[PDB]
Amino acid sequence: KKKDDEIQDLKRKIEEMSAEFAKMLKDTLDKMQERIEMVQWDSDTDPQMMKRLKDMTGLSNN
Amino acid sequence: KKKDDEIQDLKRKIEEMSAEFAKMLKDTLDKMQERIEMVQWDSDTDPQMMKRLKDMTGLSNN
């Protein structure tokens, strides 16, 4: 019973670490997008380059 | 003994996930730094913005 409980706890904490992995990955992607967009907007570069970055980043929502 | 083996496998998975998390977080940080530096160099803005972007994140080499 002790070892079963330990295995369950290990699985649960593996799931928790994976969840934090994914959540902070999404947060990092969001911050990357925000900084990139703000730099693009503050720069006088063309909306053509705006669309170029938008396409290259692969962020086109389906 | 089977339970001990399962526990050890779970611990190894935990360590592998932690290593992957740290490595790929470093990779994402490097990607963001490279993109910021490239977008900063392409623009003809005064190195004032270079220094401002360097100082804002507090990532000054320690």
Short mmCIF file of N, CA and C in Angstrom, two decimals:
data_model
loop_
_atom_site.label_atom_id
_atom_site.label_comp_id
_atom_site.label_asym_id
_atom_site.label_seq_id
_atom_site.Cartn_x
_atom_site.Cartn_y
_atom_site.Cartn_z
N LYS A 1 0.83 -1.20 0.00
CA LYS A 1 0.00 0.00 0.00
C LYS A 1 0.86 1.25 0.00
N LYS A 2 1.93 1.25 0.79
CA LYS A 2 2.82 2.40 0.81
C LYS A 2 3.40 2.66 -0.58
N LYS A 3 3.86 1.61 -1.25
CA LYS A 3 4.46 1.82 -2.56
C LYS A 3 3.42 2.24 -3.60
N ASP A 4 2.20 1.72 -3.51
CA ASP A 4 1.14 2.20 -4.39
C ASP A 4 0.87 3.68 -4.18
N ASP A 5 0.81 4.11 -2.92
CA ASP A 5 0.59 5.53 -2.63
C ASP A 5 1.74 6.37 -3.18
N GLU A 6 2.97 5.89 -3.03
CA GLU A 6 4.12 6.63 -3.54
C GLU A 6 4.08 6.74 -5.06
N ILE A 7 3.70 5.66 -5.75
CA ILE A 7 3.59 5.70 -7.20
C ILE A 7 2.51 6.69 -7.63
N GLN A 8 1.37 6.68 -6.93
CA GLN A 8 0.32 7.64 -7.26
C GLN A 8 0.79 9.07 -7.05
N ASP A 9 1.50 9.32 -5.94
CA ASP A 9 2.02 10.67 -5.69
C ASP A 9 3.02 11.08 -6.75
N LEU A 10 3.90 10.17 -7.16
CA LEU A 10 4.87 10.48 -8.21
C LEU A 10 4.16 10.81 -9.52
N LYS A 11 3.13 10.04 -9.87
CA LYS A 11 2.38 10.33 -11.09
C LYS A 11 1.70 11.69 -11.00
N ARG A 12 1.10 12.00 -9.84
CA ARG A 12 0.43 13.28 -9.68
C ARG A 12 1.41 14.45 -9.80
N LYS A 13 2.59 14.32 -9.21
CA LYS A 13 3.55 15.42 -9.27
C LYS A 13 4.19 15.51 -10.66
N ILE A 14 4.31 14.39 -11.37
CA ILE A 14 4.71 14.44 -12.77
C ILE A 14 3.68 15.23 -13.58
N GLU A 15 2.40 14.96 -13.34
CA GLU A 15 1.35 15.70 -14.03
C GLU A 15 1.42 17.18 -13.69
N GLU A 16 1.67 17.50 -12.42
CA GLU A 16 1.77 18.90 -12.01
C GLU A 16 2.94 19.60 -12.70
N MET A 17 4.09 18.93 -12.77
CA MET A 17 5.25 19.53 -13.43
C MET A 17 5.00 19.71 -14.92
N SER A 18 4.33 18.75 -15.56
CA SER A 18 3.98 18.92 -16.97
C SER A 18 3.01 20.09 -17.15
N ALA A 19 2.05 20.23 -16.24
CA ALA A 19 1.10 21.33 -16.33
C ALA A 19 1.79 22.68 -16.19
N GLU A 20 2.72 22.80 -15.24
CA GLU A 20 3.46 24.05 -15.10
C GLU A 20 4.33 24.30 -16.33
N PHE A 21 4.99 23.25 -16.83
CA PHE A 21 5.68 23.32 -18.12
C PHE A 21 4.81 24.00 -19.17
N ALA A 22 3.63 23.43 -19.44
CA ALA A 22 2.78 23.94 -20.50
C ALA A 22 2.30 25.36 -20.20
N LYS A 23 1.90 25.62 -18.95
CA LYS A 23 1.35 26.93 -18.62
C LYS A 23 2.39 28.03 -18.79
N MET A 24 3.60 27.82 -18.28
CA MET A 24 4.60 28.86 -18.42
C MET A 24 5.13 28.93 -19.85
N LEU A 25 5.05 27.83 -20.60
CA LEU A 25 5.37 27.90 -22.02
C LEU A 25 4.40 28.81 -22.75
N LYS A 26 3.10 28.66 -22.47
CA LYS A 26 2.10 29.53 -23.07
C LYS A 26 2.31 30.98 -22.64
N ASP A 27 2.65 31.20 -21.37
CA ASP A 27 2.93 32.56 -20.91
C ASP A 27 4.13 33.15 -21.64
N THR A 28 5.18 32.36 -21.83
CA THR A 28 6.36 32.83 -22.55
C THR A 28 6.03 33.15 -24.00
N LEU A 29 5.23 32.30 -24.64
CA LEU A 29 4.82 32.59 -26.01
C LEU A 29 4.00 33.87 -26.08
N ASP A 30 3.11 34.08 -25.11
CA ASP A 30 2.32 35.31 -25.08
C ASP A 30 3.21 36.54 -24.92
N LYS A 31 4.18 36.47 -24.01
CA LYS A 31 5.08 37.61 -23.82
C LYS A 31 5.94 37.85 -25.05
N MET A 32 6.40 36.77 -25.69
CA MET A 32 7.15 36.90 -26.93
C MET A 32 6.32 37.61 -27.99
N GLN A 33 5.07 37.18 -28.17
CA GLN A 33 4.19 37.81 -29.14
C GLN A 33 3.96 39.28 -28.81
N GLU A 34 3.72 39.58 -27.53
CA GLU A 34 3.45 40.96 -27.13
C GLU A 34 4.65 41.86 -27.40
N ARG A 35 5.84 41.42 -27.00
CA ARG A 35 7.04 42.22 -27.22
C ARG A 35 7.31 42.39 -28.71
N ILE A 36 7.17 41.31 -29.49
CA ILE A 36 7.40 41.40 -30.93
C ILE A 36 6.43 42.38 -31.56
N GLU A 37 5.15 42.30 -31.19
CA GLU A 37 4.15 43.19 -31.77
C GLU A 37 4.42 44.64 -31.39
N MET A 38 4.77 44.90 -30.13
CA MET A 38 5.03 46.28 -29.72
C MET A 38 6.26 46.84 -30.44
N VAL A 39 7.32 46.04 -30.58
CA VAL A 39 8.49 46.50 -31.31
C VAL A 39 8.14 46.77 -32.77
N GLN A 40 7.37 45.87 -33.39
CA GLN A 40 6.95 46.07 -34.77
C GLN A 40 6.18 47.38 -34.91
N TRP A 41 5.23 47.63 -34.01
CA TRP A 41 4.41 48.83 -34.12
C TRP A 41 5.22 50.09 -33.88
N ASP A 42 6.14 50.07 -32.91
CA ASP A 42 6.93 51.27 -32.65
C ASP A 42 7.91 51.54 -33.79
N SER A 43 8.41 50.49 -34.44
CA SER A 43 9.24 50.67 -35.61
C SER A 43 8.40 51.13 -36.79
N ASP A 44 8.96 52.02 -37.60
CA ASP A 44 8.26 52.56 -38.76
C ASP A 44 8.23 51.60 -39.93
N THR A 45 8.57 50.33 -39.73
CA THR A 45 8.62 49.38 -40.84
C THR A 45 7.22 49.16 -41.40
N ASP A 46 7.17 48.62 -42.62
CA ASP A 46 5.93 48.58 -43.37
C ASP A 46 4.99 47.51 -42.81
N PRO A 47 3.67 47.71 -42.92
CA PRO A 47 2.73 46.62 -42.62
C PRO A 47 3.03 45.37 -43.43
N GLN A 48 3.73 45.53 -44.56
CA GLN A 48 4.19 44.35 -45.30
C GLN A 48 5.14 43.52 -44.44
N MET A 49 6.09 44.17 -43.77
CA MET A 49 6.96 43.42 -42.86
C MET A 49 6.20 42.96 -41.63
N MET A 50 5.18 43.73 -41.22
CA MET A 50 4.29 43.26 -40.15
C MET A 50 3.71 41.90 -40.50
N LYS A 51 3.11 41.79 -41.68
CA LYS A 51 2.52 40.53 -42.13
C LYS A 51 3.59 39.47 -42.34
N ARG A 52 4.78 39.87 -42.78
CA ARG A 52 5.87 38.91 -42.93
C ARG A 52 6.21 38.26 -41.60
N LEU A 53 6.36 39.06 -40.54
CA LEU A 53 6.62 38.49 -39.22
C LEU A 53 5.45 37.65 -38.74
N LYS A 54 4.22 38.13 -38.97
CA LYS A 54 3.05 37.38 -38.53
C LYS A 54 3.01 36.00 -39.17
N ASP A 55 3.34 35.92 -40.46
CA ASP A 55 3.34 34.63 -41.15
C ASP A 55 4.52 33.77 -40.70
N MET A 56 5.70 34.37 -40.54
CA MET A 56 6.88 33.58 -40.18
C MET A 56 6.73 32.97 -38.79
N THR A 57 6.14 33.72 -37.85
CA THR A 57 5.97 33.21 -36.50
C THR A 57 5.01 32.02 -36.44
N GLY A 58 4.24 31.78 -37.49
CA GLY A 58 3.29 30.68 -37.48
C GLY A 58 2.20 30.83 -36.44
N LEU A 59 1.70 32.05 -36.24
CA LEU A 59 0.68 32.33 -35.24
C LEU A 59 -0.70 32.55 -35.86
N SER A 60 -0.87 32.22 -37.13
CA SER A 60 -2.16 32.39 -37.80
C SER A 60 -3.18 31.44 -37.18
N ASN A 61 -4.14 31.99 -36.45
CA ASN A 61 -5.15 31.17 -35.80
C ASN A 61 -5.98 30.42 -36.83
N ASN A 62 -6.30 29.16 -36.52
CA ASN A 62 -7.12 28.34 -37.40
C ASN A 62 -8.60 28.60 -37.17
N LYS B 1 8.88 -5.33 -5.12
CA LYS B 1 9.95 -5.03 -6.06
C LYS B 1 9.41 -4.37 -7.32
N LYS B 2 8.27 -4.87 -7.83
CA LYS B 2 7.63 -4.20 -8.96
C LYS B 2 7.28 -2.75 -8.62
N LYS B 3 6.75 -2.53 -7.42
CA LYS B 3 6.37 -1.18 -7.00
C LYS B 3 7.60 -0.27 -6.91
N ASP B 4 8.70 -0.79 -6.37
CA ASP B 4 9.94 -0.02 -6.31
C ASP B 4 10.43 0.33 -7.71
N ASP B 5 10.33 -0.61 -8.64
CA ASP B 5 10.71 -0.33 -10.02
C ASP B 5 9.84 0.77 -10.62
N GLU B 6 8.53 0.71 -10.38
CA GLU B 6 7.64 1.74 -10.91
C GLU B 6 7.97 3.10 -10.31
N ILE B 7 8.26 3.14 -9.01
CA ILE B 7 8.61 4.39 -8.35
C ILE B 7 9.88 4.97 -8.95
N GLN B 8 10.89 4.12 -9.17
CA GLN B 8 12.13 4.59 -9.76
C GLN B 8 11.91 5.11 -11.17
N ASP B 9 11.07 4.43 -11.95
CA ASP B 9 10.76 4.91 -13.30
C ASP B 9 10.08 6.27 -13.25
N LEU B 10 9.15 6.46 -12.30
CA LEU B 10 8.50 7.75 -12.16
C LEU B 10 9.50 8.84 -11.79
N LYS B 11 10.42 8.54 -10.88
CA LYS B 11 11.44 9.52 -10.50
C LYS B 11 12.32 9.89 -11.69
N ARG B 12 12.72 8.89 -12.48
CA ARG B 12 13.52 9.16 -13.67
C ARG B 12 12.76 10.03 -14.66
N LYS B 13 11.47 9.75 -14.85
CA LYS B 13 10.65 10.59 -15.71
C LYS B 13 10.59 12.01 -15.19
N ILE B 14 10.46 12.18 -13.87
CA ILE B 14 10.42 13.51 -13.29
C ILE B 14 11.71 14.27 -13.60
N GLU B 15 12.85 13.61 -13.40
CA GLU B 15 14.13 14.26 -13.67
C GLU B 15 14.26 14.63 -15.14
N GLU B 16 13.85 13.73 -16.04
CA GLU B 16 13.93 14.02 -17.46
C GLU B 16 13.05 15.21 -17.83
N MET B 17 11.83 15.26 -17.29
CA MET B 17 10.95 16.38 -17.57
C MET B 17 11.53 17.69 -17.05
N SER B 18 12.13 17.66 -15.86
CA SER B 18 12.74 18.88 -15.33
C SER B 18 13.89 19.35 -16.22
N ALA B 19 14.74 18.42 -16.66
CA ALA B 19 15.85 18.80 -17.54
C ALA B 19 15.34 19.38 -18.85
N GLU B 20 14.32 18.75 -19.45
CA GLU B 20 13.75 19.28 -20.68
C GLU B 20 13.15 20.66 -20.46
N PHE B 21 12.44 20.84 -19.34
CA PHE B 21 11.84 22.13 -19.03
C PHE B 21 12.91 23.22 -18.98
N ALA B 22 13.98 22.98 -18.21
CA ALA B 22 15.02 23.99 -18.09
C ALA B 22 15.69 24.27 -19.43
N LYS B 23 16.04 23.21 -20.16
CA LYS B 23 16.73 23.39 -21.44
C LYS B 23 15.88 24.19 -22.42
N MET B 24 14.60 23.84 -22.56
CA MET B 24 13.79 24.49 -23.58
C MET B 24 13.35 25.88 -23.13
N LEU B 25 13.29 26.13 -21.82
CA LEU B 25 13.12 27.50 -21.36
C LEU B 25 14.32 28.35 -21.74
N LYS B 26 15.53 27.81 -21.57
CA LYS B 26 16.72 28.51 -22.03
C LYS B 26 16.65 28.76 -23.53
N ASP B 27 16.18 27.77 -24.29
CA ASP B 27 16.05 27.92 -25.73
C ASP B 27 15.08 29.04 -26.09
N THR B 28 13.93 29.09 -25.41
CA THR B 28 12.96 30.15 -25.69
C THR B 28 13.51 31.52 -25.34
N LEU B 29 14.23 31.62 -24.21
CA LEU B 29 14.85 32.89 -23.85
C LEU B 29 15.85 33.33 -24.91
N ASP B 30 16.67 32.39 -25.40
CA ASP B 30 17.63 32.72 -26.45
C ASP B 30 16.92 33.16 -27.72
N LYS B 31 15.82 32.48 -28.08
CA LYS B 31 15.07 32.86 -29.27
C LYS B 31 14.53 34.28 -29.14
N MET B 32 13.96 34.61 -27.98
CA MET B 32 13.44 35.96 -27.77
C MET B 32 14.55 36.99 -27.84
N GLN B 33 15.70 36.70 -27.22
CA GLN B 33 16.82 37.62 -27.27
C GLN B 33 17.28 37.85 -28.71
N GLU B 34 17.39 36.77 -29.48
CA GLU B 34 17.84 36.90 -30.87
C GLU B 34 16.85 37.72 -31.69
N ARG B 35 15.55 37.45 -31.54
CA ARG B 35 14.56 38.21 -32.30
C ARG B 35 14.58 39.68 -31.91
N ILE B 36 14.68 39.97 -30.61
CA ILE B 36 14.72 41.36 -30.17
C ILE B 36 15.95 42.06 -30.74
N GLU B 37 17.10 41.40 -30.68
CA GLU B 37 18.33 42.00 -31.18
C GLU B 37 18.25 42.25 -32.68
N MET B 38 17.70 41.29 -33.43
CA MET B 38 17.59 41.45 -34.88
C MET B 38 16.65 42.59 -35.24
N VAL B 39 15.48 42.64 -34.60
CA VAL B 39 14.53 43.71 -34.88
C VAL B 39 15.09 45.05 -34.45
N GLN B 40 15.94 45.06 -33.43
CA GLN B 40 16.55 46.30 -32.96
C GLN B 40 17.63 46.79 -33.92
N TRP B 41 18.44 45.86 -34.45
CA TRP B 41 19.49 46.24 -35.39
C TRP B 41 18.91 46.67 -36.73
N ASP B 42 17.86 46.00 -37.20
CA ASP B 42 17.31 46.34 -38.51
C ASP B 42 16.81 47.79 -38.53
N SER B 43 16.16 48.22 -37.45
CA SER B 43 15.71 49.60 -37.34
C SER B 43 16.91 50.53 -37.16
N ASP B 44 16.84 51.69 -37.81
CA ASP B 44 17.90 52.69 -37.73
C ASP B 44 17.83 53.52 -36.46
N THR B 45 17.08 53.08 -35.45
CA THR B 45 16.91 53.87 -34.24
C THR B 45 18.24 54.07 -33.53
N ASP B 46 18.34 55.17 -32.80
CA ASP B 46 19.57 55.51 -32.11
C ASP B 46 19.91 54.43 -31.09
N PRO B 47 21.20 54.14 -30.85
CA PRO B 47 21.56 53.14 -29.83
C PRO B 47 20.96 53.41 -28.46
N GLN B 48 20.30 54.56 -28.30
CA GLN B 48 19.54 54.81 -27.08
C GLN B 48 18.53 53.70 -26.83
N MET B 49 17.79 53.31 -27.87
CA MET B 49 16.85 52.20 -27.75
C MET B 49 17.56 50.88 -27.51
N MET B 50 18.73 50.67 -28.12
CA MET B 50 19.52 49.49 -27.82
C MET B 50 19.78 49.37 -26.32
N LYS B 51 20.31 50.45 -25.73
CA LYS B 51 20.63 50.42 -24.31
C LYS B 51 19.38 50.30 -23.45
N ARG B 52 18.29 50.97 -23.85
CA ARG B 52 17.05 50.88 -23.08
C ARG B 52 16.52 49.45 -23.06
N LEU B 53 16.50 48.78 -24.22
CA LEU B 53 16.01 47.41 -24.26
C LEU B 53 16.95 46.47 -23.51
N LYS B 54 18.26 46.73 -23.56
CA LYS B 54 19.19 45.92 -22.78
C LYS B 54 18.93 46.06 -21.29
N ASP B 55 18.67 47.29 -20.82
CA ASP B 55 18.55 47.53 -19.39
C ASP B 55 17.18 47.14 -18.85
N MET B 56 16.14 47.18 -19.69
CA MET B 56 14.78 46.98 -19.17
C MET B 56 14.62 45.60 -18.53
N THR B 57 15.11 44.56 -19.19
CA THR B 57 14.89 43.20 -18.72
C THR B 57 15.75 42.84 -17.51
N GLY B 58 16.72 43.67 -17.15
CA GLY B 58 17.61 43.34 -16.06
C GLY B 58 18.47 42.13 -16.32
N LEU B 59 18.63 41.74 -17.59
CA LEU B 59 19.44 40.59 -17.97
C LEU B 59 20.91 40.95 -18.15
N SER B 60 21.35 42.06 -17.57
CA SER B 60 22.75 42.45 -17.68
C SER B 60 23.65 41.34 -17.13
N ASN B 61 24.73 41.05 -17.85
CA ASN B 61 25.61 39.96 -17.46
C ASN B 61 26.13 40.19 -16.05
N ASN B 62 26.08 39.14 -15.23
CA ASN B 62 26.51 39.22 -13.84
C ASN B 62 27.76 38.37 -13.61
#
